[PDB]
Amino acid sequence: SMNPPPPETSNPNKPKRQTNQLQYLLRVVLKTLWKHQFAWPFQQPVDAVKLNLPDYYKIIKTPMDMGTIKKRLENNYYWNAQECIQDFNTMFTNCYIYNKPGDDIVLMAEALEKLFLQKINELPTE
Numbered sequence: 001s002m003n004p005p006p007p008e009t010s011n012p013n014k015p016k017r018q019t020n021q022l023q024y025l026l027r028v029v030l031k032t033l034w035k036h037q038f039a040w041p042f043q044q045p046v047d048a049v050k051l052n053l054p055d056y057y058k059i060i061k062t063p064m065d066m067g068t069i070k071k072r073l074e075n076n077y078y079w080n081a082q083e084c085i086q087d088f089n090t091m092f093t094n095c096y097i098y099n100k101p102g103d104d105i106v107l108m109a110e111a112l113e114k115l116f117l118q119k120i121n122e123l124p125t126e
């Protein structure tokens with residue numbers, strides 16, 4: 001029923017790079033999704049207490065959210081663009097695993113995912 005610690009957004013032992021692709025992921029991709037009308041469920045770690053979801057963190061064992069991603073990008077946490085893309089994909093997949101296919105939140109995630117995949121199709125070359 002309680003929340004786990006959130007995913008780390010810094011770690012002095014983890015290697016990292018600043019690449020043009022990661023800058024794009026922050027300045028274009030994250031910013032575009034963050035401002036979307038459907039972003040709000042995804043802007044912070046899932047609070048299973050507030051949401052009365054005592055099974056959330058029994059079903060979702062790799063939690064991810066755009067607040068964490070935003071901090072990771074701002075903090076230069078990632079080694080490459082693929083690490084960040086994987087975090088977005090985990091976030092969307094978690095929503096589809098936890099929720100039923102007809103749910104409103106699934107429609108919202110699907111709209112954000114469509115936009116996300118459009119923006120990463122324009123991902124600049126390394």
Ligand SMILES: CCn1c2c(c(=O)[nH]c1=O)[C@H]1C(=C(C)N2)C(=O)OCc2ccccc2OCCOc2cc(C)ccc21
Nearest residue numbers: 040041042046047050051052094095098099103104105108
């Ligand atoms: C991403 C994590 N997430 C998630 C929800 C969810 O259902 N599934 C998830 O995976 C919830 C939810 C959030 C922040 N996040 C929220 O704010 O819920 C308030 C709430 C509190 C107590 C009781 C019911 C209740 O709302 C029932 C409808 O829930 C909806 C419906 C829509 C359109 C969007 C989100 C949600």
